Every structure is written in structure tokens, then in C-alpha cells.
Design a binder for this molecule. Structure first.
Ligand SMILES: *[C@@H]1O[C@H](CO)[C@@H](O[C@@H]2O[C@H](CO)[C@@H](O[C@@H]3O[C@H](CO[C@H]4O[C@H](CO)[C@@H](O)[C@H](O)[C@@H]4O)[C@@H](O)[C@H](O[C@H]4O[C@H](CO)[C@@H](O)[C@H](O)[C@@H]4O)[C@@H]3O)[C@H](O)[C@H]2NC(C)=O)[C@H](O)[C@H]1NC(C)=O
Ligand SMILES: *[C@@H]1O[C@H](CO)[C@@H](O[C@@H]2O[C@H](CO)[C@@H](O[C@@H]3O[C@H](CO[C@H]4O[C@H](CO)[C@@H](O)[C@H](O)[C@@H]4O)[C@@H](O)[C@H](O[C@H]4O[C@H](CO)[C@@H](O)[C@H](O)[C@@H]4O)[C@@H]3O)[C@H](O)[C@H]2NC(C)=O)[C@H](O)[C@H]1NC(C)=O
Ligand SMILES: *[C@@H]1O[C@H](CO)[C@@H](O[C@@H]2O[C@H](CO)[C@@H](O[C@@H]3O[C@H](CO)[C@@H](O)[C@H](O)[C@@H]3O)[C@H](O)[C@H]2NC(C)=O)[C@H](O)[C@H]1NC(C)=O
Ligand SMILES: *[C@@H]1O[C@H](CO)[C@@H](O)[C@H](O)[C@H]1NC(C)=O
Ligand SMILES: *[C@@H]1O[C@H](CO)[C@@H](O)[C@H](O)[C@H]1NC(C)=O
Ligand SMILES: *[C@@H]1O[C@H](CO)[C@@H](O)[C@H](O)[C@H]1NC(C)=O
Ligand SMILES: *[C@@H]1O[C@H](CO)[C@@H](O)[C@H](O)[C@H]1NC(C)=O
Ligand SMILES: *[C@@H]1O[C@H](CO)[C@@H](O)[C@H](O)[C@H]1NC(C)=O
Lengths: 167, 316, 317
């Protein structure tokens, strides 16, 4: 089955951003034959690349892509949030040893200062300039809940807790 | 015109000159017709650190240098240091601060609950919702969620533009006293055209047992230079901190400028009350005319009509 | 002996202006023999928009202002702008800088003055400088430059961690009460690898005319059998803010647990001093035992002992 790949490495896009979905697969060809399913309903997209501009809440849900007569791909879940900080990860589930990227993202790509990362209620890192939590070798202890507190426009706000679990 | 050049001198890290000397170069005013004042974020600067000296005169053009000594903390607090010139009954204000560092401050909401004076004496409580540090007053509106109970309370959303490149929006809701006495919190929501979520703030009466305040008035101590008496009214063991303190002179209310009320503090006693020492400064003439002074306390824990008066005379 | 005053114009937040006006005023220089040089990091300026006009003439003296326009981007580059004037063959230079910016990369600095109780009493005067919101403590150093005094005392700095992954460094330096009352000051200088320019905070005595506080103790107002007797000690017309209040009921000083002091508020009118109230509440078991009940106030302008004691006796009424 083909794999649905997102141009942004995070499946937690904002409200109004552009996202590109590619139905990657080897030995497939025939770009003109690619069906797209949104909640089980066929869409108007025909090519293997689907572009979403100014995404709304209705665009959230499961996306599926099918090519030729092969079985349907995984229904990748894309969810849209609307808050001050919606810290994003590469994937909800990450295999052990795979790199993991965590970044505290604010509204309209606004710069975030005084970023403090808390894991299951315990602080992990503190920075004055926004940075990335890059775990090259994911461990079992990394499982839990991550949330960032950041000072944006001289106002301190707390993000939505996450469910970062590894296998 | 009095072109005010409010220049901040070099902060001199190398030298021991911590205090910055703000120079308010005043030109275009009239001789012996100019008054200079200093304001720190809409607050008058009362310390006598001003060194207003006449530089030169070219006729009616008198170059005035008003030197304000500001501590490093005040200057670096991103204040709104204002040089105010009064001439011919006209006031001109020049505002200065450091050139911006860090990010600009975002819109911040403040909620003012009704004062006990308007809640238990005048019976006209009002809830205030004030959003400040707002950028543009376009497509911004305030919605009030009544939550418990329903009533028609259409109000104003009036906007005032400040002199520090910021504007504020204030909405006042006249509420009924009975709902607040029983306890009915409301919500204020402010909405901007491009915001993540509208800012919502909730108001609710503070829970806890109410204790009747104890009020005591102390007579002036001895004859202190026969110039000030400094009457003291101590109020202790009351909860919550929402309380109204007033001074009455021979049945006439005394303005809040004359008497100062200390901020409530958590007493170390088990009653969980607050102790406040209202100090009223009265000269010899006021006290020697057989004037009786009454300390009046308004609180919700008191019985009807939520007023306690303690009167002290001068013949005792 | 000309007087040099180099100033930078204020950035207007309301008006849409993007040029900073540098003014170099030279007073009492030599007529027909003048020279003004604008240096940016010890380099001569290239722009020719240097409006120089004679302010005034004092016969053998003259006052002249040099005006320059600086872009905000150039000014924010931490360029050490300097005005140089050649008088009698001597080059006098004045470097401005914006205002050594502010707390960089976090790191909030608090320079706490000594408590107004260990100066004129027991011997333990110290000045403390605390830096918080530090990413790391590596290669970060704090100096305690003693201005105009130097002395030989050495400072001690210790680190502390918190629950927000922040490191706070507190440095304490012993001082001398005589040095503090003579007007000497100190300079806490913090240097961190991130920002090359160290942050300096200078502390001196609070300016103003010192005044002797007036202290009065009021008798308890509780009528008959109230269990928690209350004593009030009021201090008025004290300047500066440095003052301490305690009690010495029957020898040993009363613990701060059974005592409180209100926050200082500025007194309206009268003088420039403040007013404070201290409340001491004790159960009705020590009132029949304690007899001294003396409120003591320590201020730096009271007298040679720097102590004012007011005693109230329970054998009254
Ligand atoms: C541009 O200039 C404007 C105008 O000056 C500034 O707006 C002011 O901002 C300040 C600071 O936020 C506001 O002050 C705040 O007011 C509230 C309470 O004040 C009212 O109530 C008290 C009695 O309770 C009255 O004495 C007072 O006069 C007011 O009626 C509170 O939200 C704040 O107090 C809380 O925070 C402070 C810390 O700052 C604590 O010490 C307090 O205990 C408390 O927790 C605060 O006092 C002020 O009201 C604003 N003025 C107006 C007209 O709106 C802008 O901030 C300024 N912009 C910039 C960028 O500098
Ligand atoms: C990570 O967590 C740490 C630990 O909590 C935080 O560090 C605290 O930061 C706060 C805010 O800066 C500090 O509070 C400030 O301390 C100073 C005075 O406090 C000392 O002195 C008083 C007596 O004078 C003691 O009671 C007290 O214990 C301290 O020894 C002052 O700078 C501040 O008060 C002054 O300013 C405020 C306005 O800001 C006024 O209202 C006050 O009246 C007064 O003028 C303030 O109290 C606090 O001390 C720090 N704690 C420690 C243990 O160092 C970090 O800030 C936090 N980091 C982040 C990014 O959140
Ligand atoms: C396809 O199915 C998905 C299943 O998740 C649907 O996503 C859901 O869409 C609804 C309607 O937009 C969302 O509800 C909204 O959520 C927030 C709450 O703050 C707010 O925008 C609205 O008040 C509303 O309640 C819901 O959250 C969302 N679910 C998830 C998990 O994101 C999607 O709508 C379906 N698509 C179609 C075309 O039916
Ligand atoms: C999305 O693409 C459109 C053009 O199709 C562009 O105008 C818009 O800025 C893009 N949005 C983002 C968030 O990049
Ligand atoms: C975090 O990673 C993303 C994705 O590669 C990148 O765009 C961003 O710049 C990184 N952030 C930092 C602070 O390096
Ligand atoms: C996932 O995160 C939620 C909060 O978003 C938390 O309540 C929950 O315990 C987490 N773990 C799960 C569902 O296993
Ligand atoms: C309040 O403002 C919002 C956001 O601009 C707007 O959609 C709404 O219609 C406004 N409500 C009014 C004007 O009653
Ligand atoms: C003090 O810190 C600075 C930071 O730039 C460093 O260059 C210097 O070597 C340090 N001095 C000592 C004595 O460690």
C-alpha cells in the first residue's frame, strides 16, 4: 500500500495553512490515476499531489489515497487546532531509535520566547530563543505528555498537552 | 510652540552615574509663564529631584532645561516619562522612553469588581472590563456572558486612545446588588479580527466565611509640633478584603486625597482577617475647632445597613 | 575649558519617524578654532549631513551644536558613537551608546540594597546581586567593583536551580556602614558568553534629605476581655525608605511571627517622608506578664545610636 506523506513534517497544521499530500509508492507510475478519499468520500483531486490552501476545521479528519487496483492506504489523521501554542511533533507514534522533533509553534508563525518544555509535569528544557527538541535516539522514557509554556508578545501562555508515546 | 525635546543623556556604563538625567529642552514658551511637571506613566513625580535651570534668553524665547534624575530601573522599565509644560492655560505633554527592545506587549484584559461603597450604600454596583495594549480599534468587540441568571444589560464599549501609541477599550456593566450578594459570576470576552481565541475572563465572588470587622479609632499621640494630628483607624478581622473606608468630619465626607488607606494584608491570626490602618492627616486648625471625626466602614459581613461608624471627639 | 554634552534624540512611538538626532553641544570653546568629529566604533563618519550651527556667542567664548542623523538600524547595531572636540591641542572624546540595552538572553538582574537593620546595630552589612533566568552557568562571571573605595573585601557567589530549568546566581559582598553613609557605591557587573557587552548595575545611597522619623505607640483599644490584645506602633516622616521596626518586650526581642508591618505608602502633603504602621497581636496571657512593651525603630538619620524606643506600660487605665 502507498504512503501518505505531508510536506510539513507535522500533522498538526494551523487554521489557514497550506498542506501538500503525496501518495508515495514505488513501481506505481500513472500519476493521472490517483483517487483521494476524505472520510470515505471521493474528492475532486485526480493527481498524486493534493494541495490544501487556507485549511478550515472541516478539512480535519482522515485522508486516504488509492492508486490503481492496490489496496487503500492508511487513513492519515490531520487535525486543525486554534490556540496560542500548539507544539507539534513529527508523529504521534515514533518507533524506537527514530529521530523525534518537537517544536513549540505559535499562531501565524509568531516568534516565541521564554520557551519552557514540561514532560508529564516535570520541566525538561528552558530557552530564551525558540529551539527544537531533537531526540536522535528515541527511548522508552521519552513516553508521556509534553507541553510548552512560552512568552509571546510579552504574554505568557501554556500550550495543549501532547501524547508523545513510543513503541 | 513649546517644542519639547525630551532627550535621555548617555547612560554612562563606565562611570558611576546610575541615574539618567532626562533633559526636557523647552523652547517657544513665554517668560515667567511656564510651569514644568514630570509624570511617570500617568503618575505625577513628586520627589524634588527637578533641576530646572534657565539656559539662555533671546527675548521671549527662553531655553529651559528641566533635568529629571531617573533610576536605571525606572528608565529601563519601558515607562512613559512625560514632560508637561503649562503655559497660558494650555498643557503640552511630551512622552519619552527607550527605543523598543523585546517584542511589543500584547492585548491584556483587566477585570474590576464593584466597590463595596457602590454595592452596599448607593446600591449601584458596576463591573469593569478594560482591555489595554490594543493595536487597532477595528472589528474589536466585547461580549458579556451573564452565565447564571438572565437580564438585559446593554452597555458601552468606549475606546480611548493613549499617547504611547496604544489604545484601550472599557466596558462597564451596572449589575444588581442582590445577584452579587448571593453570588453570580459573569464573564467578559474581547474579540479581535485576527486573534487565536477571544480573551475571556470570569468574575465570581470570593468564597469563605464572612467575619464582622473590628474597628478602633486611636486618638492623636501627644502634641507633635502642633501641625499634624494623623488620626488612625484600625480595621481588623474581616473577610473578604473588599471593604470601604471613609472619614466624615462633622457629618461631611472627607476626600480620599487627605486620608490614606493601607493595602490589605493577611493577618497572622487564625481569623484570616485583614488589618488596615487608615491614616487621616489633619492640621492644628481642623482639630482645634471641636470637630468630631467618624471612621465609617462598609463591609458585607456587617448587619444592616452594612455600615459601622466610630466617632471620636476632641473634648475627651 | 569647553563643556561637552552628547545626546541622542528619543524614538517617537506615535509619530512615524525613523531617524535619531545626535546632538553634540560644545560650550565655551575658542572662536574660529573649532573641530567636531563623529566616530562610529573608532571610525570617521562618511555621511556629510552634519548640520553645525553656532548656538550663541559669549565674547571670548562660543557655544555650538552639531546635528547628525542616524538610521535606527545603524543605531541598534550597538555602535559606540563618539563626539570628539579638539580644544587647545587636546582631543576630548565622549562615547554615548544607546543605553547598554537591557536584560539580554533573559537573565534578570536585581541589586538588593542592604537591610536597614544590620548597619547601625550588629555587625553584618552586605550587598547582594541576583541574576535569574540563565540558560547555563558556564563561563558566566559576576564582579563587585567597589566604586571610589576599592577596599580588600571579597565577594562570594552561589548558584541555585529551580523547577523551570533556570539557574539563579546570587553574589554577596560585605560592605561598611561608614562607606555606605559616606556616599560610596558599588557596581555589580555580569558577563555571559552570549552577549559580549557585560551588564552593569550600580548601587548607591538613596538620594534625598534624610529626616528623623517620629514614632508613637498607641494603647490597646479593646474594651474589656478581648482575648487577642493589639499594639500599634506608627512611624511617620522618615526618609529615605531604609528603616526597620522591632519590639523588645521584656528583654528578648519579640519574634516576627507575632508581628506585622504594613507596606510603606507616600504621605500626602506635609513632608517628603513615608508612614508605616506595625501591629503586634498577642493572646491575653502575656499582657498580665510582659511589662516592658517597647517598640524600637532603627533609621540612618535618627541620632548617633540610630535607635528610637517608645515604651508602653500595662499598668495604666
Ligand atoms: C500606555 O499608557 C496607558 C495609560 O497609562 C497604560 O495603561 C495602563 O496600564 C496600567 C498597567 O497595566 C494599568 O494599571 C492597572 O490597573 C488595574 C487596577 O487599577 C485600577 O484600580 C485601582 C484600584 O484597584 C486604582 O487605583 C487604579 O487607578 C485603577 O482604577 C490592574 O489591572 C493593575 O493592577 C494590578 O497589577 C499591578 C502590577 O502592574 C499590581 O501592583 C496590582 O496589585 C494589581 O495586581 C494595574 O494597576 C492602567 O489602568 C492602564 N491605564 C489605562 C488608562 O488604561 C498602558 O499600559 C501604556 N502602554 C505601554 C505599552 O506602556
Ligand atoms: C523560574 O522560577 C524562578 C524561581 O521561582 C523565578 O525566579 C523568581 O523571579 C521572580 C520574578 O523576577 C523574583 O521575584 C522578584 O524578586 C525581587 C525581590 O525578591 C527578593 O527580595 C524580597 C525582599 O525584598 C524577598 O522577600 C524575596 O524572597 C527575594 O529575596 C524583586 O526584583 C521583585 O520584587 C520587586 O518588583 C516587583 C515587580 O516586578 C514589585 O511588585 C515588588 O514590590 C518589588 O519592587 C520580585 O519579587 C523571585 O525572587 C525569583 N525567585 C528566586 C528564588 O530567585 C524565575 O523568574 C522563573 N523563570 C521564568 C522564566 O519564569
Ligand atoms: C471527517 O471526520 C472528522 C473526524 O474527526 C471530522 O472532524 C471533526 O470536525 C468537526 C466539525 O468541524 C470538529 O468540531 C469542531 O471542533 C472545534 C472544537 O473546538 C470547533 O472548531 C467547532 O466548535 C466544532 O465543534 C471536530 O473537532 C473534528 N474532529 C477532530 C478530531 O478534529 C470532520 O469534520 C469530518 N469531515 C466531514 C467533511 O464531515
Ligand atoms: C497558500 O498558497 C496560496 C496560493 O495558492 C498563497 O497565496 C498563500 O500565501 C499560501 N499560504 C501559506 C500559509 O503559505
Ligand atoms: C525546527 O525544525 C524545523 C523543521 O526542520 C525547522 O524549520 C526549524 O527552523 C527548526 N527550528 C530551529 C529553532 O532550528
Ligand atoms: C493523552 O493526553 C491527554 C491530554 O490531552 C491525557 O489526559 C491522557 O492521559 C494522555 N494519555 C493517554 C490517552 O494515554
Ligand atoms: C464582533 O466582532 C466579530 C469579529 O470581527 C464579528 O464577526 C462580529 O460580527 C462582531 N459582532 C457585532 C458587531 O455585534
Ligand atoms: C569572564 O567571562 C567572560 C565572558 O566573556 C570570559 O571571556 C572571561 O574569560 C571570564 N573571566 C574569567 C576570569 O573567568
Amino acid at each position: 500500500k502507498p504512503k501518505v506523506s505531508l510536506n510539513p513534517p507535522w500533522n498538526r497544521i494551523f487554521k489557514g495553512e497550506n498542506v501538500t499530500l503525496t501518495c508515495n509508492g514505488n513501481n506505481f507510475f500513472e500519476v493521472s490515476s490517483t483517487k483521494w478519499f476524505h472520510n470515505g468520500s471521493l474528492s475532486e483531486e485526480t493527481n498524486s499531489s493534493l494541495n490544501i490552501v487556507n485549511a478550515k476545521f472541516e478539512d480535519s479528519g482522515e485522508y486516504k489515497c488509492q492508486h490503481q487496483q492496490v489496496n487503500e492506504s492508511e487513513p492519515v489523521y490531520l487535525e486543525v487546532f486554534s490556540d496560542w501554542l500548539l507544539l507539534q511533533a513529527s508523529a504521534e507514534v515514533v518507533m524506537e531509535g527514530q529521530p523525534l522533533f518537537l517544536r513549540c509553534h505559535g499562531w501565524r508563525n509568531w516568534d516565541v520566547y521564554k520557551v519552557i518544555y514540561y514532560k508529564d509535569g516535570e520541566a525538561l528544557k528552558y530557552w530564551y530563543e525558540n529551539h527544537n527538541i531533537s531526540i536522535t535516539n528515541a527511548t522508552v522514557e521519552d513516553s508521556g505528555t509534553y507541553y510548552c509554556t512560552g512568552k509571546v508578545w510579552q504574554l505568557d501562555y501554556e500550550s495543549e498537552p501532547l501524547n508523545i508515546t513510543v513503541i | 510652540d513649546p517644542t519639547l525635546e525630551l532627550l535621555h543623556s548617555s547612560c554612562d556604563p563606565n562611570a558611576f552615574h546610575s541615574t539618567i538625567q532626562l533633559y526636557c529642552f523647552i523652547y517657544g514658551h513665554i517668560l515667567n509663564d511656564v510651569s514644568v511637571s514630570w509624570l511617570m506613566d500617568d503618575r505625577e513625580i513628586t520627589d524634588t529631584l527637578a533641576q530646572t535651570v534657565l539656559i539662555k534668553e533671546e527675548g521671549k524665547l527662553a531655553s529651559t532645561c528641566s533635568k529629571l534624575n531617573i533610576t536605571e530601573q525606572q528608565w529601563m522599565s519601558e515607562s512613559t516619562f512625560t514632560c508637561k509644560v503649562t503655559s497660558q492655560g494650555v498643557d503640552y505633554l511630551a512622552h519619552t522612553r527607550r527605543c523598543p527592545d523585546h517584542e511589543p506587549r500584547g492585548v491584556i484584559t483587566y477585570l474590576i469588581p464593584p466597590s463595596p461603597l457602590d454595592l452596599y450604600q448607593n446600591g449601584a454596583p458596576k463591573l469593569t472590563c478594560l482591555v489595554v495594549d490594543l493595536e487597532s480599534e477595528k472589528n474589536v468587540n466585547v461580549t458579556w456572558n451573564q452565565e447564571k441568571k438572565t437580564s438585559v444589560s446593554a452597555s458601552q464599549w468606549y475606546t480611548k486612545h493613549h499617547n504611547n501609541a496604544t489604545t484601550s477599550i472599557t466596558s462597564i456593566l451596572p449589575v444588581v446588588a442582590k445577584d452579587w450578594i448571593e453570588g453570580y459570576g459573569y464573564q467578559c470576552i474581547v474579540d479581535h479580527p485576527d486573534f487565536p481565541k477571544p480573551i475571556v475572563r470570569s468574575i465570581t465572588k470570593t468564597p469563605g466565611q464572612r467575619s464582622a470587622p473590628e474597628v478602633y479609632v486611636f486618638p492623636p499621640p501627644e502634641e507633635e509640633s502642633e501641625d499634624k494630628r494623623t488620626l488612625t483607624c484600625l480595621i481588623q478581622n474581616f473577610f473578604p478584603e473588599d471593604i470601604s473606608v471613609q472619614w466624615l468630619g462633622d457629618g461631611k465626607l472627607i476626600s480620599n486625597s487627605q486620608h490614606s488607606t493601607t493595602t490589605p494584608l493577611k493577618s497572622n491570626g487564625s481569623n484570616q482577617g485583614f488589618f488596615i490602618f487608615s491614616r487621616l492627616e489633619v492640621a492644628k486648625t481642623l482639630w482645634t475647632q471641636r470637630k468630631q471625626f467618624t471612621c465609617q466602614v462598609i463591609h458585607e459581613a456587617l448587619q444592616k445597613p452594612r455600615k459601622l461608624e466610630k466617632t471620636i471627639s476632641t473634648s475627651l
